[PDB]
DNA sequence: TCTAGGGTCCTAGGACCC
DNA sequence: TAGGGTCCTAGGACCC
């Protein structure tokens with residue numbers, strides 16, 4: 001009953017698009033991200049910038065101290081969305097079992113596939129080659145019997161490469177696999193796991209499921225299963241977006257409600273436009289607001305509400321501003337909508 | 343260095359129902 | 361008849 005799962009992942013996706021579209025950026029350190037003045041972070045960087053330590057999620061002021069010649073780009077999301085549509089059409093030439101996880105990556109289930117003599121290895125190579133031939137961007141891939149191993153595999157021969165894990169190879173692969181490599185095990189969980197002596201899947205194999213369930217709940221079960229190589233999650237091609245949000249961080253903290261209302265007045269048209277692309281009548285389940293203060297604490301209040309409404313969002317922002325706030329600067333204002341269930 | 347914006351999923355207490 | 365299920369809501373880890 002061994003499945004064949006491919007995970008395909010574009011290399012340096014936004015930066016790779018900006019280099020294709022402007023080859024002057026091919027050989028200098030570049031990153032997509034907000035300026036230091038706009039208090040931004042790096043969305044991604046190309047390999048010349050990564051050499052300096054530039055990474056996604058790094059504050060832009062840190063990126064520039066590492067890499068003073070970093071060229072900073074604002075990002076062209078329609079160009080990225082166009083590349084995404086194109087690689088997803090390429091995936092559809094091989095299977096309809098496609099679960100996109102973001103613009104630039106997807107799981108493919110090729111168990112029942114007829115192409116390339118049923119070789120998942122060869123299908124993944126053909127997909128990478130087609131992507132390069134038709135988009136002039138490179139992709140990496142991972143092939144494994146389950147989702148999470150395929151996703152780990154696609155990182156191991158990046159860029160422009162792939163890696164295959166057979167069922168025979170899974171135990172040796174797991175034995176020394178750090179837990180932080182498992183998708184869903186982040187910094188906070190890895191630090192709690194490390195503090196109790198659990199660093200690798202090998203360690204977690206030496207653990208009692210009951211203990212893990214008590215200490216971590218349902219996450220304890222996922223940890224126990226992943227460390228065994230167990231991941232029965234099916235490739236699901238039917239997922240749908242559940243929310244849409246629009247938020248902005250100010251270049252300077254705001255301290256007056258008039259400044260906050262001004263911001264919302266700019267955010268609301270953007271939220272209406274994006275909602276209307278997917279729900280023309282603007283009918284929704286909930287709407288709400290988000291404030292983030294200068295001490296980085298963040299609050300949201302949302303409520304049942306039938307149709308996107310600018311004044312109610314203003315009124316709700318005003319309550320949050322008056323109430324849970326307390327004289328701090330505000331760095332971010334956001335609007336949010338929960339979509340009607342399908 | 344000084345910390346984004348797009349999202350998904352889980353948890354947990356109280357309201358509400360039976 | 362003392363408790364079980366199910367929304368509502370806020371927060372936060374985590375993902376790209």
Ligand SMILES: *P([O])(=O)(O[C][C]1O[C](N2[C]=C([C])C(=O)[N]C2=O)[C][C]1[O])OP([O])(=O)OP([O])([O])=O
Nearest residue numbers: 009010011012013014015043044056057104376
């Ligand atoms: P990935 O595959 O992790 O992200 C794809 C693109 O999403 C954007 N993005 C990513 C991260 C991790 C983030 O924190 N913020 C983002 O905005 C930019 C990404 O390009 O990232 P990648 O393709 O760039 O890097 P590699 O080559 O390692 O896959």
Ligand SMILES: [Mg+2]
Nearest residue numbers: 009010011012
């Ligand atoms: Mg990528």
Ligand SMILES: [Mg+2]
Nearest residue numbers: 009010104105
């Ligand atoms: Mg990706």
